[PDB]
Design a protein around this ligand. Structure first.
Ligand SMILES: O=C(NCCOCCO[C@H]1O[C@H](CO)[C@@H](O)[C@H](O)[C@@H]1O)c1ccc2cc(C(=O)NCCOCCO[C@H]3O[C@H](CO)[C@@H](O)[C@H](O)[C@@H]3O)ccc2c1
Ligand SMILES: O=C(NCCOCCO[C@H]1O[C@H](CO)[C@@H](O)[C@H](O)[C@@H]1O)c1ccc2cc(C(=O)NCCOCCO[C@H]3O[C@H](CO)[C@@H](O)[C@H](O)[C@@H]3O)ccc2c1
Ligand SMILES: [Ca+2]
Ligand SMILES: [Ca+2]
Ligand SMILES: [Ca+2]
Ligand SMILES: [Ca+2]
Ligand SMILES: [Mn+2]
Ligand SMILES: [Mn+2]
Ligand SMILES: [Mn+2]
Ligand SMILES: [Mn+2]
Lengths: 237, 237, 237, 237
């Protein structure tokens, strides 16, 4: 079972597995059962922005989801990630549908990672920025139902040629090169991630949501992770 | 009286205005009596590094000070800076000697500040980086005994023509352009500061220390703020 | 008499002082009579982008100006900027109007400058990024008829409350920190400027243009620099 | 047959395959026989810096190799890289030795790559920065005899425990993630590469040198490409 850390943009209350009774944003440390949640005020058919930050000094993982001309939703969590995560990781975006469904459109994705070591005090860094996605994007690893190059976007779950999101779909996109997310001889370690998304649904209810996640480098869609497990966890422990 | 927010490197305990028994780092909100400190084994003659960070999600001002191959010293304080600092500020570095003295050399200084708007979801940013200082650096404002150009460094307090530190000396360097440090309608504000330093003294007691600070744009050194007031404060309140 | 280097977006042919017969972009070294130009098919009412670049290796000033889904205009001139500009300078944007007029609206501006020094092989950098301009922009120096804050933009030339641009107007925005644009002992030096704009006009010929420029720190609008002079040159030599 | 673009730092003059009679830098478009060279006063045992730049507005590839307090050496070549390179590429460092030998040490490596597209005017970017290389650098592909970890440096070719260099050696380090180096529909595209090296010989003759290169993503060391072929080319046509 793969080590997962994720910030989930959960659009579907799964009350049987501990979801609060409203669309919410969550911090998931090795479980779909969030460690901290926050009411999120989703706008169907509106482009939204997500922003995740962590730094090894506060050892706190914050995320803020926001639409133009509306309030934030924030959710933070004290967590020492070098006790959770392997030293090297891949980071990625994940998304799923179930009985109910939604477009899981990714529009822009950026990410920054820094290690400021304790031996030499000289920093290592990684930075990537996707504002559009071509049809044959080679620094991305696509898993399951994800496809790029439709209107310059990254489409995480399926969309028909008639634009209608499909059900029982899971897709992920991972950045191709692994990231050095912590190291014992490091004074300060920090990362930032940002993406913009468009969730649109013809149903009265949209599901299930998008997640930003960090994981061991060889992670893949777990068996049966469609629907409420967001392509992230095999089960619901 | 200016509005100072500062992170002090205090190499001399003034136990009588409230410093602890050992040389320390601390966070100063509008008063030289640190709202929070931590002990800091200053290595005399030796190049150290200060990293300061703050972000509007956490509203936590944090700082790490470290030497190569030595445990670091860290200190953090939760403070809503937008109720303390004017909306625009200037950032700078400051130092002072009293009876006991030390060289207060700055070898490199860098700073990043960012504001993402909630109306437009677009970013304003400022970044500057000094890895060597020149004789007539026009983006710095030097106050008091601060000079630049000596071996390409920034000497905060005064040195002699025979490399000797001097007492009763005080000096400051401000980044010339003003800085937009919080905006009522921003979703996330964050800033980051880094400098390196060599403090050297022939004495057995070096004093007083070095501070990164943030102030109102028009700030000047207060009268007789040498010594234990670090060129920041008019008094010990 | 100021020293001006500029990249000009020239909406209005003034053939009697050397402009070509059509709208154009040009490099200007200490003269309004461009050393080099290209045909610019300016699009009334559309947002466009300009990208300017220079580096000490190749000592060549190049600009690209285009609109979405339109071909670009580029223009290039070999110039050793350190036999032209003072070692410290200020960067800015400028626009004028004359008998004919246009909106000279600035939606974004970013600038980046780097000095890798021969003595140490370590780098000084300045970077600033504007994506909205507040009503009180303290890191901008506003000159002439220039204003920030209306809809988050910088309006370089006078715009009435009804939104119509006026004739007989000149306006300049400069960044507040002077910029170390060259050093005799730097292995490599480079700078990069980008801005987005909106020239909308009611007149069947709009006038006069926008310009990015670099000048000595204290530069101010020359006398009678409206119209074809573009707020940069006192006369047309 | 791999496609190769390389800036080479050639320490051993092979006058039989077109090398000049003197240690030199050169620019290699698909051939070990440089398209353009420049005398380079190698400095045995000291740390040097190499800065490479290319942009699509000017289709000129440039490098500067210099030491602390010496004259730079620069070489440049007009070349439209998108007639020579596939759109996606991997970037890397290479070194080799023949009969005569040298330590081919890399102490730092940074690379920046930027793509602004014409359909949207919205930018994609990659940046990575190695100031120290660890025992298991997961974002690096090590080929031949390249190892990381010793002194925090990257050794492209075999060094014994003594520090003694080892003949008939070749090694390459490539960045893990593939890089979008051009795109037919981008307004402006550019990349930057920087690294610091130490070339220490016991012989009076060092050989053969270090190279920054860009190749097809699946590139591997050509057979028998030690010596003058630097790890890049199969034969010396
Ligand atoms: O005791 C103090 N101050 C005492 C106050 O109570 C204790 C607080 O001590 C300090 O201790 C800490 C700093 O060390 C701080 O935490 C405190 O705030 C405080 O400032 C005190 C304060 C300032 C001083 C400044 C100098 C100075 O200008 N530096 C150069 C070295 O000495 C001067 C030589 O120049 C001339 O000097 C004399 C002229 O008169 C002649 O004899 C000499 O031949 C010569 O021509 C020297 C001694 C000082 C002593
Ligand atoms: O049709 C066109 N558009 C171009 C398309 O090409 C058409 C080719 O054919 C033209 O010319 C042909 C032959 O001549 C005719 O047959 C055609 O019918 C047509 O007119 C066209 C475009 C530009 C023109 C510029 C002038 C011109 O003389 N320009 C400068 C004169 O001064 C104006 C006031 O000056 C004041 O205000 C200016 C503007 O605010 C400031 O800069 C000044 O500093 C000052 O404050 C005149 C006619 C133009 C006609
Ligand atoms: Ca759910
Ligand atoms: Ca003190
Ligand atoms: Ca004109
Ligand atoms: Ca050779
Ligand atoms: Mn949930
Ligand atoms: Mn103190
Ligand atoms: Mn012109
Ligand atoms: Mn050669």
């Amino acid at each position: 079972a793969d080590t997962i850390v994720a910030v989930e943009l959960d659009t579907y209350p799964n009350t049987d597995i501990g979801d609060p009774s409203y669309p919410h944003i969550g911090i998931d440390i090795k479980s779909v059962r969030s460690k901290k949640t926050a009411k999120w005020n989703m706008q169907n058919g509106k482009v939204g922005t997500a922003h995740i930050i962590y730094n090894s000094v506060d050892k706190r993982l914050s995320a803020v989801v926001s639409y133009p001309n509306a309030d934030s939703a924030t959710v933070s969590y004290d967590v020492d990630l070098d006790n959770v995560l392997p030293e090297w990781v891949r980071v990625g975006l994940s998304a799923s549908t179930g009985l109910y469904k939604e477009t899981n459109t990714i529009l822009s994705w950026s990410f920054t990672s820094k290690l400021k070591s304790n031996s030499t005090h000289e920093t290592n860094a990684l930075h990537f920025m996707f504002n559009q996605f071509s049809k044959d994007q080679k620094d991305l690893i696509l898993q399951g139902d994800a496809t790029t190059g439709t209107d310059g976007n990254l489409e995480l779950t399926r969309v028909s040629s008639n634009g209608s999101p499909q059900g029982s779909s899971v897709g992920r996109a991972l950045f191709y090169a692994p990231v050095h997310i912590w190291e014992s001889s490091a004074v300060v370690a920090s990362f930032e991630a940002t993406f913009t998304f468009l969730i649109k649904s013809p149903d009265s209810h949209p599901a299930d949501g998008i997640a930003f996640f960090i994981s061991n480098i060889d992670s893949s869609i777990p068996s049966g992770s469609t629907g409420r497990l967001l392509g992230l966890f095999p089960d619901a422990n």
